[PDB]
Amino acid sequence: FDPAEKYKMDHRRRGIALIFNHERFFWHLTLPERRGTCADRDNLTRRFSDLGFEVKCFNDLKAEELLLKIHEVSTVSHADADCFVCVFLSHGEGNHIYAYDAKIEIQTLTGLFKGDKCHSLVGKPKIFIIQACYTLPAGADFLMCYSVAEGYYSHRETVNGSWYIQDLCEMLGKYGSSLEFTELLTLVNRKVSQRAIGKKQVPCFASMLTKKLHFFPKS
């Protein structure tokens, strides 16, 4: 009935910001790759803490640990939380095995939080920010954010980080609390797209959200 309806963000906790590092099948690890990834994690941890999130970081190197942690996030109660965030960071060179593993990891992650698998988040926004190395993942109140659209260029990681994660992090710093999230993501669209003169890196987001999304500060 209401053209201004918002997801209720007045729960005790904001929620979890899961930052997932895809590192297992990569081989040539130039300092630009390594330092730039640290830059993207560190930057995202800052921005997401400031919006109230519990940031949790792990990589897929520790085969034994990803089991435990991944299991924890899924089963734990989110009843007292507003939303869930998951950032999937990856690298550029990407061999085919690395690239293939990526898709399977993202498919599992997303699949964990479908309402059928996770009652505590039902009706609450699930936001996935995916640094591709552009897909088809599904669910109501899901927000799929992609570093790059289907068949567009993706600039090499730098020691400073990646265009997408940088620019997102920037917008989050400046407009995190102010703007409706998809508006903010649209700003990230223009910013990155204006960063063989291939024409552009054009990021994307796919919304299955049913209400407005605001990260006004909590008490």
C-alpha angle 9-169-84 in degrees, rounded to nearest 5: 35
Query: Which of the residues 133, 145, 169, 204 is marked catalytic?
Result: 133
Q: Which of residues 96-135 bind a second copy (CB under 8 A)?
A: 115-116, 134-135
- C-alpha 82/C-alpha 174 separation (Å) is 21
Size of the site for a second copy (CB under 8 A): 54
Closest CB to a second copy among 21 and 106?
106
DSSP, res 46: H
Q: Which of residues 19-38 bind a second copy (CB under 8 A)?
A: none
Closest CB to a second copy among 26 and 134?
134
- Cα 4 to Cα 109, 213, 218: the distances in Å are 31, 10, 20
The yes-or-no answer on residue 145 being catalytic is: no
Tokens of 163: 């265009």
The yes-or-no answer on residue 118 being catalytic is: no
- C-alpha 60/C-alpha 46 separation (Å) is 22
Chain residues binding a second copy by CB under 8 A are 1-6, 10, 115-116, 134-140, 149-152, 173-175, 177-180, 182-187, 189-191, 193, 199-200, 202-212, 214, 216-217, 219
